[PDB]
Enzyme design. Sequence first.
Site, mmCIF file in Angstrom:
data_model
loop_
_atom_site.group_PDB
_atom_site.id
_atom_site.type_symbol
_atom_site.label_atom_id
_atom_site.label_comp_id
_atom_site.label_asym_id
_atom_site.label_seq_id
_atom_site.Cartn_x
_atom_site.Cartn_y
_atom_site.Cartn_z
ATOM 1 N N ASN A 250 2.405 12.866 2.600
ATOM 2 C CA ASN A 250 1.152 13.409 3.117
ATOM 3 C C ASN A 250 0.954 13.105 4.588
ATOM 4 O OD1 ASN A 250 -1.349 11.482 3.692
ATOM 5 N ND2 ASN A 250 -0.107 10.482 2.112
ATOM 6 N N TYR B 113 -2.502 13.965 5.968
ATOM 7 C CA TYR B 113 -3.898 14.384 6.038
ATOM 8 C C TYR B 113 -4.525 14.096 7.415
ATOM 9 C CZ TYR B 113 -5.125 15.946 1.284
ATOM 10 O OH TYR B 113 -5.223 16.617 0.096
ATOM 11 N N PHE C 179 -6.688 11.458 8.133
ATOM 12 C CA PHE C 179 -8.053 10.941 7.993
ATOM 13 C C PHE C 179 -9.098 12.075 8.034
ATOM 14 C CE2 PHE C 179 -7.377 6.377 9.966
ATOM 15 C CZ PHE C 179 -6.919 5.916 8.711
ATOM 16 N N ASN D 38 -12.748 1.890 1.921
ATOM 17 C CA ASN D 38 -11.679 1.816 2.898
ATOM 18 C C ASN D 38 -12.159 2.490 4.219
ATOM 19 O OD1 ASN D 38 -9.188 2.663 4.299
ATOM 20 N ND2 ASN D 38 -8.100 1.927 2.417
ATOM 21 N N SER E 134 -2.333 3.392 8.345
ATOM 22 C CA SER E 134 -2.084 4.829 8.229
ATOM 23 C C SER E 134 -0.951 5.273 9.164
ATOM 24 C CB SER E 134 -3.336 5.656 8.490
ATOM 25 O OG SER E 134 -3.012 7.036 8.523
ATOM 26 N N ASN F 255 -0.503 8.273 9.965
ATOM 27 C CA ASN F 255 -0.949 9.619 10.422
ATOM 28 C C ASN F 255 -2.066 9.672 11.480
ATOM 29 O OD1 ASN F 255 0.996 10.621 8.525
ATOM 30 N ND2 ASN F 255 -0.542 10.366 6.891
ATOM 31 N N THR F 256 -2.362 8.527 12.092
ATOM 32 C CA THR F 256 -3.201 8.483 13.301
ATOM 33 C C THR F 256 -2.398 7.731 14.367
ATOM 34 O OG1 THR F 256 -5.336 8.714 12.134
ATOM 35 C CG2 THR F 256 -5.446 7.718 14.327
ATOM 36 N N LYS G 40 -5.318 -3.681 4.957
ATOM 37 C CA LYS G 40 -4.289 -2.892 4.322
ATOM 38 C C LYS G 40 -3.119 -2.708 5.284
ATOM 39 C CE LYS G 40 -3.558 1.166 1.451
ATOM 40 N NZ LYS G 40 -4.100 2.247 0.588
ATOM 41 N N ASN H 101 0.390 0.413 2.184
ATOM 42 C CA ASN H 101 0.195 1.834 2.479
ATOM 43 C C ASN H 101 1.488 2.651 2.226
ATOM 44 O OD1 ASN H 101 -1.118 4.260 3.577
ATOM 45 N ND2 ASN H 101 -2.442 2.832 4.754
HETATM 46 C C1 LIG Z 1 -10.290 19.723 -17.093
HETATM 47 C C2 LIG Z 1 -9.985 19.044 -18.402
HETATM 48 N N1 LIG Z 1 -10.477 19.463 -19.605
HETATM 49 C C3 LIG Z 1 -10.064 18.703 -20.647
HETATM 50 CL CL1 LIG Z 1 -10.616 19.101 -22.360
HETATM 51 S S1 LIG Z 1 -9.021 17.384 -20.249
HETATM 52 C C4 LIG Z 1 -9.108 17.850 -18.589
HETATM 53 C C5 LIG Z 1 -8.399 17.089 -17.533
HETATM 54 O O1 LIG Z 1 -7.222 16.827 -17.671
HETATM 55 N N2 LIG Z 1 -9.149 16.733 -16.486
HETATM 56 C C6 LIG Z 1 -8.759 16.254 -15.286
HETATM 57 C C7 LIG Z 1 -9.768 16.042 -14.360
HETATM 58 C C8 LIG Z 1 -9.494 15.556 -13.099
HETATM 59 C C9 LIG Z 1 -8.179 15.267 -12.765
HETATM 60 C C10 LIG Z 1 -7.162 15.484 -13.683
HETATM 61 O O2 LIG Z 1 -5.867 15.207 -13.344
HETATM 62 C C11 LIG Z 1 -5.392 15.280 -12.069
HETATM 63 C C12 LIG Z 1 -5.357 14.118 -11.270
HETATM 64 C C13 LIG Z 1 -4.860 14.227 -9.969
HETATM 65 C C14 LIG Z 1 -4.384 15.457 -9.474
HETATM 66 N N3 LIG Z 1 -3.929 15.518 -8.180
HETATM 67 C C15 LIG Z 1 -2.862 16.229 -7.825
HETATM 68 O O3 LIG Z 1 -2.280 16.946 -8.654
HETATM 69 C C16 LIG Z 1 -2.329 16.191 -6.461
HETATM 70 C C17 LIG Z 1 -1.281 16.880 -6.279
HETATM 71 N N4 LIG Z 1 -0.257 17.422 -6.075
HETATM 72 C C18 LIG Z 1 -2.813 15.461 -5.458
HETATM 73 O O4 LIG Z 1 -3.890 14.692 -5.609
HETATM 74 C C19 LIG Z 1 -2.119 15.552 -4.119
HETATM 75 C C20 LIG Z 1 -2.950 15.009 -2.954
HETATM 76 C C21 LIG Z 1 -1.788 14.183 -3.519
HETATM 77 C C22 LIG Z 1 -4.448 16.609 -10.275
HETATM 78 C C23 LIG Z 1 -4.946 16.528 -11.589
HETATM 79 C C24 LIG Z 1 -7.435 15.975 -14.951
HETATM 80 C C1 LIG Z 2 -2.594 12.157 -0.481
HETATM 81 C C2 LIG Z 2 -2.752 10.688 -0.104
HETATM 82 C C3 LIG Z 2 -3.790 10.270 0.719
HETATM 83 C C4 LIG Z 2 -3.932 8.929 1.034
HETATM 84 N N1 LIG Z 2 -4.954 8.511 1.820
HETATM 85 C C5 LIG Z 2 -5.133 7.217 2.119
HETATM 86 C C6 LIG Z 2 -6.262 6.725 2.933
HETATM 87 O O1 LIG Z 2 -7.105 7.525 3.346
HETATM 88 N N2 LIG Z 2 -6.375 5.426 3.221
HETATM 89 C C7 LIG Z 2 -5.495 4.515 2.759
HETATM 90 O O2 LIG Z 2 -5.645 3.294 3.020
HETATM 91 N N3 LIG Z 2 -4.470 4.908 1.972
HETATM 92 C C8 LIG Z 2 -4.228 6.196 1.643
HETATM 93 N N4 LIG Z 2 -3.124 6.570 0.844
HETATM 94 C C9 LIG Z 2 -2.231 5.508 0.375
HETATM 95 C C10 LIG Z 2 -2.552 5.119 -1.058
HETATM 96 O O3 LIG Z 2 -3.833 4.475 -1.038
HETATM 97 C C11 LIG Z 2 -1.464 4.145 -1.503
HETATM 98 O O4 LIG Z 2 -1.527 3.064 -0.568
HETATM 99 C C12 LIG Z 2 -0.052 4.784 -1.407
HETATM 100 O O5 LIG Z 2 -0.102 6.188 -1.767
HETATM 101 C C13 LIG Z 2 0.922 4.050 -2.312
HETATM 102 O O6 LIG Z 2 0.484 4.135 -3.662
HETATM 103 P P1 LIG Z 2 1.145 5.216 -4.672
HETATM 104 O O7 LIG Z 2 2.670 5.148 -4.497
HETATM 105 O O8 LIG Z 2 0.645 4.759 -5.989
HETATM 106 O O9 LIG Z 2 0.599 6.572 -4.233
HETATM 107 C C14 LIG Z 2 -2.955 7.941 0.493
HETATM 108 C C15 LIG Z 2 -1.915 8.373 -0.307
HETATM 109 C C16 LIG Z 2 -1.785 9.695 -0.622
HETATM 110 C C17 LIG Z 2 -0.652 10.143 -1.503
HETATM 111 O O1 LIG Z 3 -5.286 10.394 5.810
HETATM 112 C C1 LIG Z 3 -4.076 10.107 5.856
HETATM 113 O O2 LIG Z 3 -3.221 10.819 6.440
HETATM 114 C C2 LIG Z 3 -3.548 8.832 5.312
HETATM 115 C C3 LIG Z 3 -4.142 7.605 5.571
HETATM 116 C C4 LIG Z 3 -3.469 6.479 5.058
HETATM 117 O O3 LIG Z 3 -3.964 5.362 5.219
HETATM 118 N N1 LIG Z 3 -2.313 6.593 4.370
HETATM 119 C C5 LIG Z 3 -1.797 7.816 4.170
HETATM 120 O O4 LIG Z 3 -0.736 7.994 3.552
HETATM 121 N N2 LIG Z 3 -2.400 8.908 4.635
#
Ligand SMILES: Cc1nc(Cl)sc1C(=O)Nc1cccc(Oc2ccc(NC(=O)/C(C#N)=C(\O)C3CC3)cc2)c1
Ligand SMILES: Cc1cc2nc3c(=O)[nH]c(=O)nc-3n(C[C@H](O)[C@H](O)[C@H](O)COP(=O)(O)O)c2cc1C
Ligand SMILES: O=C(O)c1cc(=O)[nH]c(=O)[nH]1
Length: 365
Positions: free
Chosen positions: A114, A116, A118, A150, A184, A186-187, A224, A253
Amino acid sequence: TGDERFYAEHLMPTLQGLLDPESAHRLAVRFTSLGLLPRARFQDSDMLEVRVLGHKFRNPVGIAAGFDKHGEAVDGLYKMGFGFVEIGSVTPKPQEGNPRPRVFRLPEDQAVINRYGFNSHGLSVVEHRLRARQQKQAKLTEDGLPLGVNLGKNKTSVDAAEDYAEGVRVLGPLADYLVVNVSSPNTAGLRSLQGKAELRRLLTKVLQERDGLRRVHRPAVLVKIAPDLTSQDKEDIASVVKELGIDGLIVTNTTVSRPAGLQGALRSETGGLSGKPLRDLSTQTIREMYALTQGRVPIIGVGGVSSGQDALEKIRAGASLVQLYTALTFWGPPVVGKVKRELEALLKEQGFGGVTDAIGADHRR
Ligand SMILES: Cc1nc(Cl)sc1C(=O)Nc1cccc(Oc2ccc(NC(=O)/C(C#N)=C(\O)C3CC3)cc2)c1
Ligand SMILES: Cc1cc2nc3c(=O)[nH]c(=O)nc-3n(C[C@H](O)[C@H](O)[C@H](O)COP(=O)(O)O)c2cc1C
Ligand SMILES: O=C(O)c1cc(=O)[nH]c(=O)[nH]1
């Protein structure tokens, strides 16, 4: 359980085919804040309970920062089964973050990259959002479900320490602990706030701001760190953290390294890598920091946790608590129960009374 298989084999791979990772992330946040999430069946065992940072944690598995950047889904996350929730990073002023696309799946590696940058609704929006549920949070915290916030810095900010100081003043009163995110990828320039004299300057100011809050509104302060620190960086951090009385460390991180063997087509995208390829780098950083701080500074271990064994390896390395973020995007919500249930079975097998007894166990045998 069939729940776990169904999410891993069918539901989550379907989601991946339908949506890009950022849309999937936004949809997840929306569905979580509405409470639309499966069964809370696994009642937490007493073994899973930990006392650290001036609080009780019903279970040691938290959601890492980045999933709920703006504090929209706190209650849905407790419902998912996490023992504590961290929101953010939150910057002082609202900001957009980097242009899209900025997040990338590496399904073969169980990894995400990622950048993003911030994207944040800013302190003010998040403050009011947390104020609307403040007393609800005080009862959750009292019941062993704490909240962390955070803090990051704005992109165009001249004075880094002032951005963190504003965050302490605004969100500190609303948090059980605060995290100074100096890691981070990414800054620009952000990660070198991890060098000595400038890290002492910055944390002195943060701790001063924190100490000036009223007692019941005075949170723990954690720092962190990245998994990409030199030995020198690590030694300096340990020293500053002991000298100043920082309450704990979050380790780690995402990484800017690209470990050999990554298969995903998107492996050369700019950004921080998370998930399975980060797992052992992060466990080794926990191990080093625990030894350098003599086991006196609580550590929250994070990076590629996706099973009870992963969690237990971090705990034995010196973590008091763990977090995950990436595993959730491949396994969905049942991953929380899975990690808790396997962690509990493993603690019985290795003869621990509870999580507390396992903390740092590798450094004593
Ligand atoms: C709607 C519903 N109805 C019944 Cl009955 S069960 C159910 C359900 O499974 N709900 C649900 C709700 C919220 C998250 C989720 O699961 C997730 C959790 C995280 C993500 N995130 C990502 O897939 C994703 C990606 N790629 C990321 O977050 C990117 C940014 C890293 C997606 C679904 C699942
Ligand atoms: C999409 C995404 C966004 C994140 N944003 C932040 C953030 O804003 N601040 C931060 O401290 N860490 C951030 N992280 C880092 C997570 O908090 C964690 O430190 C890192 O992803 C390692 O854990 P994992 O392997 O379980 O994802 C982010 C990670 C992901 C994947
Ligand atoms: O916002 C982000 O880009 C970000 C922040 C952070 O602390 N760690 C990360 O993976 N992404």
